[PDB]
Design a protein around this ligand. Structure first.
Ligand SMILES: Oc1cccc(-c2cc(Nc3cccnc3)nc(N3CCOCC3)n2)c1
Length: 808
């Protein structure tokens, strides 16, 4: 079809990858998956309420934080600005029908400046926007607008032993051999290796590697891992021994292998796209006492990063029907399985059929995600985790969306429950789909390993999001592509800003769309760009500082965005999303630590965009604008007095500081990134503190930053009242997180496995020490205070050293 061609062409443009490409494939799993997903896509399209899907009301079911539990709304019909008081449990329609008396009722209550609507049968106390404005004590300004026409959300019409024959490897450019492994969930079942031979542009063994395992004993999801050596590893490539159709693999295979540069990429079932420079390999296939109860309870009740010994697994397996009673033990129990034995696997399913407990149990995300990591290849084991995810509401789905998208790399096959799940939740929610779009486009644009699997998934989504969405994405992508070139061209080079003003002026011309949607915050529409406000930054990375006029006249603040190439913003995104999670955790405990998880979206290979926090500057700048390595205690406080004249304002900024400082002190501490520098810590003129550039720190001693300039602001020289207010919070905020150890851990693990040659046998096991695991809550309190003491003792010491290091 004429249009169908320009369609697939438009898709590819948005995707950043051509899915109809078939040059880098040895089978049809991808094409098979493209077609498989057609059902979930359309099945979801025809289920979503056109109205609710078009307005995407952002709501929640969770209770209201006590601190907030302790109101009126403004309206803006043109010149008319009627101000009305409403009961908390009033439907937006009831409030609307209430405005009908105090004055074709086919209108809707939108938000001033943003694309956020207040619709549906939901008490206004359940709209995240209202809740947000309360944690700020701001007036809820609503513009009486018309409902958006949903007509724009329409879519386009054998008992023998296993053996493989290694024909040989082909090198593009002394001694070498091939290791043929049989993995399942990162656990090797059998291993064979060829003889060593001197290097040549074509080493031919032509040998039959016989394995001790039998064909029937092969579990679906088992990978055939091929590795080349010299001892050191060089190239690696994988192959599902059982294809998407449950068929045992057969025939000739020539695989182009990925290279090592010494991790999730190690698992990918994809092959190296670049055939020119990739090493290749050709292969041929052609085929209950009290004690032992008390003894395993310790096993069940232990961190996910605690390895199971031989006896652990046996004990755990023998009493499997008793272990299946504790949901917090499933990961452990399914790790105790002999997947390389059909008889054993068959039993585990008999076991899974008896999920009386796991099904009815309250959703534990930390527990759920664990069955989705690299440790599980059994589609059935992984599928029971996705079932629990069906319970999540959008609000929560949005919290773990990033971590879930990454967990797709741990899937054996392209089409999967996890994959289909994201596609379903993204198609029901414009806001979830939006981020799904960029989260996927990010991986596709810097991960040769998983760009194929991901691209297929994104395409399945673009075909369902509707026409409206496609247009927004189109104008978003177009704009983003332009800004990225400018970012690069300028990084290659005051003659600089004169060059920026020049180039930027051309983009402004006519090529760019009038107004585009801010990727890290789709609620916002950025219109006309303010060239006179744009400037290049003074970092060696030389990022761009850009600002746009708010495309909505009923707002006129400028939208500040930063475009930067150099660092990997994927690491930043992960960290920031963890902070947002911590806040929710604290929110359940009526805790607000004023964390500032600014917007950040990776757009490609070590390049992306970052949100600008208004009236915020670097702590380092303050010390050097007043005083370079020299550090005075009064400087910080003086800066506040100045930036906040009204005593009422100043006194509140200090209250906002103590909390924000406590929040970041604890948050960074747990994530093991508290040891930073002044230049990497910022603060709002309103006293709100926050760290930045996380891609820099983890990408390359003091528990956290608690320097005497901070303490001075609290009133410490001398334990001030505020300082006690500080450490009191820290403890409360610290013990809170601990009640989610498992979650923080698995997130921490999936953050490095898919986000960072970071040792998992060491670094990964840092958070264990930090969260005082295996220690009573009371003991934990003392530890954190001890960590604070470390800061009191070092004072400026650490900072001065960072000043040295980052100068010499
Ligand atoms: O996550 C990353 C990664 C790399 C760089 C950053 C990064 C660096 C930076 N530097 C800066 C700004 C102003 C003055 N001096 C230095 N500012 C911000 N912002 C985000 C928060 O709002 C303020 C601007 N982010 C953040």
């Amino acid at each position: 079809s004429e249009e169908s061609q320009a369609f697939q062409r438009q898709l590819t443009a948005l995707i950043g990858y051509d899915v109809t490409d078939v040059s880098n494939v040895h089978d049809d799993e991808l094409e098979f998956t493209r077609r498989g997903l057609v059902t979930p896509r359309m099945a979801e399209v025809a289920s979503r309420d056109p109205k609710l899907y078009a307005m995407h009301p952002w709501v929640t079911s969770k209770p209201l934080p006590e601190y907030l539990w302790k109101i009126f709304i403004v309206i803006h019909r043109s010149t008319t600005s009627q101000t009305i008081k409403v009961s908390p449990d009033d439907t937006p329609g009831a409030i609307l029908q209430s405005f009908f008396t105090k004055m074709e009722q086919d209108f809707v209550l939108r938000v001033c400046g943003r694309d956020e609507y207040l619709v549906g049968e939901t008490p206004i106390k359940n709209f995240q926007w209202v809740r947000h404005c309360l944690k700020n004590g701001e007036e809820i300004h609503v513009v009486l607008d018309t409902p958006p026409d949903p007509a724009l959300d329409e879519v386009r019409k054998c008992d023998r032993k296993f053996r493989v024959k290694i024909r040989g490897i082909d090198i593009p450019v002394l001694t070498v051999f091939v290791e043929a492994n049989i993995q399942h969930g990162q656990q090797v079942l059998c291993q064979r290796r060829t003889s060593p031979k001197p290097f040549t542009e074509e080493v031919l063994w032509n040998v039959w590697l016989e394995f001790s395992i039998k064909i029937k004993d092969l579990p679906k999801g088992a990978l055939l891992n091929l590795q080349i050596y010299c001892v050191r590893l060089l190239y690696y490539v994988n192959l599902l021994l059982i294809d998407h159709r449950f068929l045992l693999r057969r025939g000739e295979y020539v695989l182009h292998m990925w290279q090592i540069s010494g991790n999730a990429d190690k698992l990918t079932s994809a092959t190296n796209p670049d055939k020119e420079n990739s090493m290749s390999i050709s292969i041929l296939l052609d085929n209950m006492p009290n004690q032992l109860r008390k003894q395993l309870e310790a096993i069940i009740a232990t961190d996910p990063l605690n390895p199971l010994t031989a006896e652990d697994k046996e004990l755990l397996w023998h009493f499997r029907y008793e272990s299946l009673k504790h949901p917090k033990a499933y990961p452990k129990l399914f790790s105790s399985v002999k997947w390389g034995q059909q008889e054993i696997v068959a039993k585990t399913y008999q076991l899974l059929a008896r999920r009386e407990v796991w099904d009815q149990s309250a959703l534990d995300v930390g527990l759920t995600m664990q069955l989705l990591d690299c440790n599980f290849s059994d589609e059935n084991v992984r599928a029971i985790a996705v079932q629990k995810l069906e319970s999540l509401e959008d609000d929560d789905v949005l919290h773990y969306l990033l971590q879930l998208v990454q967990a797709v790399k741990f899937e054996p096959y392209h089409d999967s429950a996890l994959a289909r799940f994201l596609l379903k939740r993204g198609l029901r929610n414009k806001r979830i789909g939006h981020f799904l779009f960029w989260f996927l486009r990010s991986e596709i644009a810097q991960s040769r390993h998983y760009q194929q699997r991901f691209a297929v998934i994104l395409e399945a989504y673009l075909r369902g999001c509707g026409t409206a969405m496609l247009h927004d994405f189109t104008q978003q992508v177009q704009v983003i592509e332009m800004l990225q070139k400018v970012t690069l061209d300028i990084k290659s080079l005051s003659q600089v800003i004169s060059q920026l003003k020049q180039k930027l002026e051309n983009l402004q011309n006519s090529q760019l769309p009038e107004s585009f949607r801010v990727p890290y915050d789709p609620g916002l529409k950025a219109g006309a760009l303010a060239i006179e406000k744009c400037k290049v930054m003074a970092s060696k990375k030389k990022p761009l500082w850009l600002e746009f006029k708010c495309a909505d006249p009923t707002a006129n603040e400028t939208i500040g965005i930063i475009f930067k190439h150099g660092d990997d913003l994927r690491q930043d995104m992960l960290i920031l999303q963890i902070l947002r999670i911590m806040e929710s955790i604290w929110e359940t405990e009526s805790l607000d630590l004023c964390l500032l998880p600014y917007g950040c979206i990776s757009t490609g290979d070590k390049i992306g965009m970052i949100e600008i926090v208004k009236d915020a500057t670097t702590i380092a700048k303050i010390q050097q604008s007043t005083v370079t390595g020299a550090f005075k205690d009064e400087v910080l406080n003086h800066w506040l007095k100045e930036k906040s004249p009204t005593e009422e304002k100043f006194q509140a900024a200090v209250e906002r500081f103590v909390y924000s400082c406590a929040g970041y002190c604890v948050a960074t501490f747990v994530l093991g990134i508290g040891d930073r520098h002044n230049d990497n810590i910022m603060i709002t003129e309103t006293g709100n503190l926050f760290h930045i550039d996380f891609g820099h720190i983890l990408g390359n001693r003091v528990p956290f930053v608690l320097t005497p300039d901070f303490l001075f602001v609290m009133g410490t020289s001398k334990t001030s009242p505020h300082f006690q207010k500080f450490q009191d919070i820290c403890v409360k905020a610290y013990l809170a997180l601990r009640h989610h150890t498992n979650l923080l851990i698995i997130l921490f693990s999936m953050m490095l496995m898919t986000g960072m040659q970071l040792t998992s046998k060491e670094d990964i096991e840092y958070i264990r020490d930090a969260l005082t695991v295996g220690k009573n809550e009371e003991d934990a309190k003392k530890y954190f205070l001890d960590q604070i003491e470390v800061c009191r003792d070092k004072g400026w010491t650490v900072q001065f050293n960072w000043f040295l290091h980052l100068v010499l």
